[PDB]
Amino acid sequence: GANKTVVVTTILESPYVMMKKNHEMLEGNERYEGYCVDLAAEIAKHCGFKYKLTIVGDGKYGARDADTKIWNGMVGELVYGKADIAIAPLTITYVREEVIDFSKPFMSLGISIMIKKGTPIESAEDLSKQTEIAYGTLDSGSTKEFFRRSKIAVFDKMWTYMRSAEPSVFVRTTAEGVARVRKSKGKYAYLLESTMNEYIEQRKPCDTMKVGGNLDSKGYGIATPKGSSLGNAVNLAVLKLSEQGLLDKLKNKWWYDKGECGSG
Amino acid sequence: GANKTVVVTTILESPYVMMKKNHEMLEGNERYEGYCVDLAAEIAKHCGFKYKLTIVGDGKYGARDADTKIWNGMVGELVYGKADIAIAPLTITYVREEVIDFSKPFMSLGISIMIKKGTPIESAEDLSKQTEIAYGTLDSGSTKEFFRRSKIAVFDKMWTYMRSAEPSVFVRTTAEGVARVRKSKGKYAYLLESTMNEYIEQRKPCDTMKVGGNLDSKGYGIATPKGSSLGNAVNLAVLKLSEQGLLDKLKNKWWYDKGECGS
Numbered sequence: 001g002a003n004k005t006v007v008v009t010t011i012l013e014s015p016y017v018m019m020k021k022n023h024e025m026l027e028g029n030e031r032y033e034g035y036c037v038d039l040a041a042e043i044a045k046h047c048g049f050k051y052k053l054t055i056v057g058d059g060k061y062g063a064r065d066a067d068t069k070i071w072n073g074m075v076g077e078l079v080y081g082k083a084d085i086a087i088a089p090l091t092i093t094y095v096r097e098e099v100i101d102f103s104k105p106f107m108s109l110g111i112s113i114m115i116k117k118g119t120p121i122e123s124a125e126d127l128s129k130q131t132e133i134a135y136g137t138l139d140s141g142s143t144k145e146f147f148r149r150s151k152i153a154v155f156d157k158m159w160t161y162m163r164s165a166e167p168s169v170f171v172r173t174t175a176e177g178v179a180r181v182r183k184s185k186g187k188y189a190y191l192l193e194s195t196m197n198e199y200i201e202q203r204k205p206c207d208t209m210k211v212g213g214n215l216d217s218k219g220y221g222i223a224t225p226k227g228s229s230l231g232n233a234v235n236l237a238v239l240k241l242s243e244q245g246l247l248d249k250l251k252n253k254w255w256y257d258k259g260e261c262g263s264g
Numbered sequence: 265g266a267n268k269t270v271v272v273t274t275i276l277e278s279p280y281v282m283m284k285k286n287h288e289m290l291e292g293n294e295r296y297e298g299y300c301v302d303l304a305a306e307i308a309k310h311c312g313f314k315y316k317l318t319i320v321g322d323g324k325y326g327a328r329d330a331d332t333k334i335w336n337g338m339v340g341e342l343v344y345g346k347a348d349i350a351i352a353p354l355t356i357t358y359v360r361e362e363v364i365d366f367s368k369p370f371m372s373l374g375i376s377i378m379i380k381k382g383t384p385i386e387s388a389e390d391l392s393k394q395t396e397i398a399y400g401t402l403d404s405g406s407t408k409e410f411f412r413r414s415k416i417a418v419f420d421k422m423w424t425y426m427r428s429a430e431p432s433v434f435v436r437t438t439a440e441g442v443a444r445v446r447k448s449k450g451k452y453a454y455l456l457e458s459t460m461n462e463y464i465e466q467r468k469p470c471d472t473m474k475v476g477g478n479l480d481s482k483g484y485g486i487a488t489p490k491g492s493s494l495g496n497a498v499n500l501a502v503l504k505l506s507e508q509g510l511l512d513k514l515k516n517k518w519w520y521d522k523g524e525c526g527s
């Protein structure tokens with residue numbers, strides 16, 4: 001591409017990055033809208049670089065294959081030099097921190113439980129002590145890896161069930177997880193990040209809800225290849241935007257409740 | 265060269281670091297107990313170093329003097345080479361990130377309001393729109409800097425009041441702020457971090473409460489001098505302890521497991 005243009009990898013995930021209405025006649029960065037689109041513009045302005053938004057080719061966040069040790073998703077695009085920076089709801093984790101750099105977090109989240117309203121589930125422990133209600137996670141992301149690695153009794157029990165459930169309880173995109181909750185008449189619960197859970201809970205058809213506390217506490221960070229010359233400036237930009245209140249403003253904008261559910 | 269004992273700067277702030285019973289006859293790290301004492305041991309174990317806990321001499325978190333440009337507090341101890349690492353409730357901020365290194369956060373917090381129970385205040389906007397109830401912050405910390413720097417109308421209005429209030433609404437320690445809330449019959453509210461607020465809420469005589477939402481969202485990080493080789497390992501240790509659930513267990517141990525205001 002053009003010299004001096006920073007290649008940004010990101011992922012189609014509402015409300016972080018979405019195709020604009022009429023995107024088919026638009027071009028370049030103007031095709032996209034959302035929290036991370038706005039955040040990319042703010043970061044680029046503070047750091048003084050031109051950039052090109054690119055949607056990750058394989059549509060995945062990033063996991064390392066156990067056999068080949070190859071990273072996929074946005075993490076892989078950073079590791080293997082296909083992108084210069086990831087501006088996306090990319091979760092800070094130990095295994096990723098070992099191979100890429102992360103800014104200080106720009107948004108908080110935790111793993112949470114989505115149910116069809118009325119499902120008799122209040123906690124992860126509730127899910128783990130029964131079998132009528134199936135449950136699963138997104139593939140190739142931090143939630144699945146969390147359960148795989150957990151030595152915490154409840155989560156280890158949940159992983160032992162999910163890894164062997166048939167048909168598979170894992171989904172390829174967040175939208176499939178949500179649809180499965182809505183279609184399963186309350187017999188499927190979806191484990192996903194509270195940010196995406198809370199976004200969906202405010203949207204029509206207003207039939208899902210987040211139940212229980214979050215199962216962990218973490219955040220999204222802007223990611224760069226290890227040793228990138230962008231990392232220091234991007235990190236300071238996140239903290240400056242945070243302290244100016246602009247991250248809160250952006251969250252309020254893209255999670256804005258127009259009252260599709262109740263009074264608003 | 266040979267391994268050397270790592271000098272840890274920290275601060276006497278409950279329940280992060282507290283004087284143990286019998287401290288008067290104890291030496292070194294055995295004098296202290298608390299969340300950050302436990303966290304220091306965990307970090308040191310994962311990273312494989314020996315360490316000495318040292319309470320910051322001036323008892324301050326860290327601010328830069330506008331005229332001399334000199335840093336005080338724990339930040340100063342790192343900046344001027346007096347300590348190798350800070351393991352404390354030290355808030356990640358832009359101006360500090362410019363001069364020291366921070367791990368990923370080990371605990372989340374936001375600025376919050378502490379009131380004596382029954383005080384007719386529900387929000388920062390409430391405080392800003394009245395004068396009967398005074399309010400202030402800790403000196404030499406991130407909360408005071410937040411109000412001093414804010415462009416948000418309500419917080420700027422609060423700062424304009426606080427900076428000129430007489431007698432001073434600012435306190436030198438959290439304990440002084442708590443005492444002022446408890447003794448002022450509802451005429452003082454204290455702006456402090458939600459972590460400390462929630463801790464005090466569970467201590468006798470159970471006469472304070474946290475009201476309103478948090479005013480911002482940030483976190484504490486383990487800090488090292490800029491470019492310290494210790495930074496990488498300490499950061500991974502924080503994320504590993506987080507993912508193992510040990511930070512959550514430590515929070516429960518020191519905030520709620522032995523809370524004094526019931527279950």
Ligand SMILES: O=S1(=O)NCN(CCF)c2ccc(Cl)cc21
Pocket residue numbers: 104105106107108219238239242247356357369370371372373481482483484
């Ligand atoms: O100070 S920070 O590193 N970056 C700014 N934000 C706000 C964006 F999430 C947060 C939030 C939570 C924690 Cl624990 C830490 C931080």
Ligand SMILES: O=S1(=O)NCN(CCF)c2ccc(Cl)cc21
Pocket residue numbers: 092093105106107108109217218219220368369370371372483502503506511
């Ligand atoms: O993944 S992290 O950088 N470090 C671990 N924790 C948990 C301890 F605070 C958090 C919490 C909140 C945010 Cl935004 C980010 C993180």
Ligand SMILES: N[C@@H](CCC(=O)O)C(=O)O
Pocket residue numbers: 061062089090091138140141142143144191192193
């Ligand atoms: N944010 C996650 C993806 C969503 C999930 O795993 O629930 C990641 O970075 O992997």
Ligand SMILES: N[C@@H](CCC(=O)O)C(=O)O
Pocket residue numbers: 325326353354355402404405406407408455456457
């Ligand atoms: N944690 C704060 C001190 C407490 C406060 O300012 O309210 C700091 O690092 O400065």
Ligand SMILES: [Cl-]
Pocket residue numbers: 020021022023024
């Ligand atoms: Cl369209």
Ligand SMILES: [Cl-]
Pocket residue numbers: 267268269
């Ligand atoms: Cl030594």
Ligand SMILES: [Cl-]
Pocket residue numbers: 285286
């Ligand atoms: Cl003892």
Ligand SMILES: [Cl-]
Pocket residue numbers: 377386387388389475476477478479
């Ligand atoms: Cl408030």
